[PDB]
Amino acid sequence: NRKLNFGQAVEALKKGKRVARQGWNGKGMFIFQRPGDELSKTFLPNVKSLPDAVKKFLMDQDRDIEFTPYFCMYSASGDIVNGWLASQTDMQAEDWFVLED
Amino acid sequence: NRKLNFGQAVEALKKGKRVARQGWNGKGMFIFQRPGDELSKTFLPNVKSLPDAVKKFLMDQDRDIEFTPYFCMYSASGDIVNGWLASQTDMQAEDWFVLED
Amino acid sequence: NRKLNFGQAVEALKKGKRVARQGWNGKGMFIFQRPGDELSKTFLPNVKSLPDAVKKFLMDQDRDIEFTPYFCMYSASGDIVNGWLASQTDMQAEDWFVLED
Amino acid sequence: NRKLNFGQAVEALKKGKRVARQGWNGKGMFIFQRPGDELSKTFLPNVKSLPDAVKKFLMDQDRDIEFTPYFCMYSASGDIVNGWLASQTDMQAEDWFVLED
Numbered sequence: 001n002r003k004l005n006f007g008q009a010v011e012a013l014k015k016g017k018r019v020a021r022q023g024w025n026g027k028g029m030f031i032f033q034r035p036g037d038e039l040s041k042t043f044l045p046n047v048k049s050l051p052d053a054v055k056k057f058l059m060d061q062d063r064d065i066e067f068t069p070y071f072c073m074y075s076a077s078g079d080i081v082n083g084w085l086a087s088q089t090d091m092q093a094e095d096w097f098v099l100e101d
Numbered sequence: 102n103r104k105l106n107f108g109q110a111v112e113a114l115k116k117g118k119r120v121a122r123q124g125w126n127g128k129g130m131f132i133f134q135r136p137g138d139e140l141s142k143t144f145l146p147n148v149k150s151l152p153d154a155v156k157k158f159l160m161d162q163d164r165d166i167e168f169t170p171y172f173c174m175y176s177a178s179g180d181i182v183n184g185w186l187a188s189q190t191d192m193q194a195e196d197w198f199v200l201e202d
Numbered sequence: 203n204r205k206l207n208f209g210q211a212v213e214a215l216k217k218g219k220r221v222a223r224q225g226w227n228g229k230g231m232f233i234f235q236r237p238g239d240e241l242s243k244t245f246l247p248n249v250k251s252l253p254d255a256v257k258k259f260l261m262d263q264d265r266d267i268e269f270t271p272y273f274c275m276y277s278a279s280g281d282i283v284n285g286w287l288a289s290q291t292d293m294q295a296e297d298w299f300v301l302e303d
Numbered sequence: 304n305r306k307l308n309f310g311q312a313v314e315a316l317k318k319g320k321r322v323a324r325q326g327w328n329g330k331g332m333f334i335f336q337r338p339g340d341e342l343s344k345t346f347l348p349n350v351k352s353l354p355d356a357v358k359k360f361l362m363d364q365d366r367d368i369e370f371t372p373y374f375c376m377y378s379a380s381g382d383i384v385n386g387w388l389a390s391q392t393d394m395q396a397e398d399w400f401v402l403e404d
C-alpha cells in the first residue's frame with residue numbers, strides 16, 4: 001500500500017482513510033478528510049465554532065448552509081490541524097502510503 | 102479600510118473580521134477565521150465530524166486534543182469552504198479590505 | 203478526457219499536459235507543470251531571477267543546486283502565475299479535464 | 304527582528320529578504336521571493352523551462368507575457384523549492400524572523 005502518488009492518496013482520503021508520506025520520517029503525522037455537511041437554518045444558530053459576524057451574516061441568509069469536506073493533518077505535535085494543504089513537493093511526490101486502520 | 106496587504110488582512114482575520122480582495126469582483130466572497138479549541142477526552146467521543154479511523158486513533162491517545170484555528174471562505178456559490186488557502190497572488194496582493202460588520 | 207479527479211489531473215501535469223476544471227467557466231485558464239533542473243555551480247552566477255541575498259548564499263555553498271518542478275497557472279488575465287496551488291475545492295473536485303494540445 | 308507575524312514576514316519577502324519560522328528548528332530552511340518579469344514575444348521562444356504545449360500556446364498569443372513573482376523555499380534538503388505555500392499554521396504563526404543578509 002505504498003509508493004503511492006498524490007492522486008492515489010487523495011482517493012484514499014475521500015474514502016475516510018489516513019495517509020502519509022515516507023519523507024515525513026516516523027513523526028506519527030498523517031492526513032485525513034473531514035466530511036462535509038449541510039446545516040439547517042434552524043440548527044445554524046447553535047454553532048459555536050463560527051465568528052459572530054459570520055454567524056449573523058449566514059442567519060440573515062435564512063437558508064440551509066453547506067460546509068465543504070476538507071483535509072486535516074494530525075501533526076508531529078499531536079494536534080489536529082484543520083485545513084491541511086498540499087505543497088508542491090507533496091503534490092508531485094511518489095512516496096505516499098495508506099496507514100493501516 | 103482598503104488597499105490592504107495580506108498581512109493586514111491576516112491580522113483582521115485573527116480578530117474575527119471578514120476580509121476580501123477587490124480583484125474578486127462583487128461575487129460576495131469573503132474569508133474568515135474559525136477559532137481553535139481543545140476538546141476534552143471525555144467530549145471527543147461525541148464528535149460527528151471525524152472519520153471513524155481518526156476518532157478511534159485519537160480516543161486511544163486518551164488525552165485532550167487541540168484543534169487549530171483555520172481560515173475559511175464564503176464562496177461565490179454561497180457555501181462555507183473550510184480550509185481556505187492563500188494563492189501566491191493573494192499573498193502578494195495589495196487590494197485587500199475588511200468587510201463592514 | 204473529462205470528468206477527471208485531481209489525481210488524474212496531476213498525472214497529466216507531470217506528463218507536460220495542460221489541465222483545467224469545468225467549474226472555471228470558459229475563462230481560458232489552465233494549469234501546467236514547469237520542469238525542474240539542477241544548475242551547475244558555474245552557471246549559477248548567471249541567474250537573473252534570484253534575489254541577491256539568495257544568490258550569494260547559494261554561491262557560497264559552492265555546489266550544484268537543484269530547483270524543483272512546480273505547477274503554474276495561465277490565469278484569466280493571461281498571465282503566467284508561478285507556483286499555483288490546489289485549494290481544498292480543487293483537490294476534491296471531479297470536473298478536471300486535459301486540454302487538447 | 305523576531306517574533307514576527309506572517310504579514311511582517313511577507314512584507315520582508317517582498318523586499319527581497321529571507322525569512323523563516325523559529326518552529327522550523329535549525330534545519331537551515333528559509334523562504335524568499337523570486338521577482339516577476341514580462342518576457343517580450345521575441346524572447347519567449349528561447350525559454351527552456353516551459354513545456355512545449357505551453358510555449359506554443361503562448362507564442363501563438365503573439366504578445367509579451369507577464370510572469371508573476373512567487374515565493375520559494377530553501378529546503379531542509381538544500382534544494383530550491385519553487386512555489387512555496389503557507390500552511391494554516393504558517394499564516395497564523397507569531398514566530399517568524401528575518402534572516403541576517
Ligand SMILES: Nc1nc2c(ncn2[C@@H]2O[C@@H]3COP(=O)(O)O[C@H]4[C@@H](O)[C@H](n5cnc6c(=O)[nH]c(N)nc65)O[C@@H]4COP(=O)(O)O[C@H]3[C@H]2O)c(=O)[nH]1
Pocket residue numbers: 034035036037046047048049050067068082135136137138140147148149150151168169183
Ligand atoms: N474549534 C473547534 N471546535 C471543534 C472542532 N471539531 C469539533 N469541535 C467542537 O465540537 C463540537 C461538536 O462537533 P461535531 O460533533 O462535529 O458537531 C458539529 C457538526 O456536526 C456540525 N458542523 C459545524 N461546522 C461543521 C463543518 O464545517 N462541517 C461539518 N461537516 N459539520 C459541521 O455542527 C455541529 C456543532 O458544531 P459546533 O457548535 O461548532 O460544535 C462543535 C465544536 O464546539 C474543530 O475543529 N474546532
Ligand SMILES: Nc1nc2c(ncn2[C@@H]2O[C@@H]3COP(=O)(O)O[C@H]4[C@@H](O)[C@H](n5cnc6c(=O)[nH]c(N)nc65)O[C@@H]4COP(=O)(O)O[C@H]3[C@H]2O)c(=O)[nH]1
Pocket residue numbers: 236237238239241248249250251252269270284337338339340349350351352353370371385
Ligand atoms: N522573473 C522571471 N523571469 C523568468 C521566468 N521564466 C523565465 N524567465 C527569464 O527568462 C530567462 C531564461 O529562462 P530559461 O530559458 O528557463 O533559462 C533558465 C533556466 O534554464 C535555468 N533556471 C533558473 N531557475 C530555474 C528554475 O527554477 N527551474 C528550472 N528548471 N530552470 C531554472 O536558468 C536559466 C537562466 O535563468 P535566468 O537567469 O533567471 O533567466 C531567465 C529569466 O530571466 C519567470 O517565471 N520569471
